[PDB]
Amino acid sequence: EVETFAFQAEIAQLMSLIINTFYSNKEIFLRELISNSSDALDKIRYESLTDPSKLDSGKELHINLIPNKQDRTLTIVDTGIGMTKADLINNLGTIAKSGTKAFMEALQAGADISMIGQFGVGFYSAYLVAEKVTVITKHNDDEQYAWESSAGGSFTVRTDTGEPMGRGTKVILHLKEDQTEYLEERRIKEIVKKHSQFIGYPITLFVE
Numbered sequence: 454e455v456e457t458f459a460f461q462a463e464i465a466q467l468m469s470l471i472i473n474t475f476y477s478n479k480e481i482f483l484r485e486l487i488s489n490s491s492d493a494l495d496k497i498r499y500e501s502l503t504d505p506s507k508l509d510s511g512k513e514l515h516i517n518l519i520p521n522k523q524d525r526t527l528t529i530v531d532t533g534i535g536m537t538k539a540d541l542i543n544n545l546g547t548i549a550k551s552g553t554k555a556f557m558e559a560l561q562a563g564a565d566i567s568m569i570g571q572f573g574v575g576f577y578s579a580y581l582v583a584e585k586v587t588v589i590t591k592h593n594d595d596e597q598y599a600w601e602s603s604a605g606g607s608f609t610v611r612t613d614t615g616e617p618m619g620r621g622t623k624v625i626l627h628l629k630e631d632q633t634e635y636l637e638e639r640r641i642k643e644i645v646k647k648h649s650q651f652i653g654y655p656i657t658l659f660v661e
């Protein structure tokens with residue numbers, strides 16, 4: 454059974470802004486998702502220093518980027534702390550609300566979209582290149598869950614009966630028809646070299 458939630462109005466407004474505004478530098482969506490993955494891996498690495506059983510769901514700390522041109526998808530896979538249902542439904546919405554006012558306020562005054570990360574809300578950049586995102590995530594104290602959003606001001610959560618994932622988050626970007634460049638290898642590599650070269654954890658770019 455699928456549950457359907459409305460986004461806070463502010464969120465739904467920022468998703469509309471990112472989907473409507475004309476801005477060509479779409480490629481920063483990647484370094485936002487990787488930086489998010491980086492923060493998540495850093496959390497589980499810290500938590501584990503005082504409670505070693507934390508990495509029973511998996512010791513390896515890495516990011517994968519996985520492009521599939523048959524599915525039209527780019528997947529940003531991490532083995533970080535993951536996300537609870539509470540996070541999905543309630544708390545990321547709660548954290549983001551302040552983030553969105555600030556960003557929005559900075560944008561007249563002439564800051565830009567590439568600066569979204571500075572405000573705690575770069576997840577939403579995905580919607581620069583993805584017509585839907587699906588997020589698969591598993592945190593230790595909790596089940597694995599599938600959140601999905603085509604914007605539209607609603608998002609779903611379900612329990613995921615899919616391939617169990619141990620601990621972490623998969624960001625499945627279902628790309629817009631004209632965004633397929635983000636499935637080439639030479640594309641993904643340049644962007645990672647440019648904006649993500651110093652991430653303290655291995656990033657393996659899969660080929661097809």
Ligand SMILES: CCCCn1c(Cc2ccc3c(c2)OCO3)nc2c(N)nc(F)nc21
Nearest residue numbers: 489490493533534535536545576588600622
């Ligand atoms: C806002 C920072 C925390 C949430 N978060 C984010 C940003 C984010 C914000 C809002 C989101 C979302 C993801 O999926 C659904 O809605 N990425 C994460 C990740 N890879 N791993 C963990 F452990 N947490 C993540």
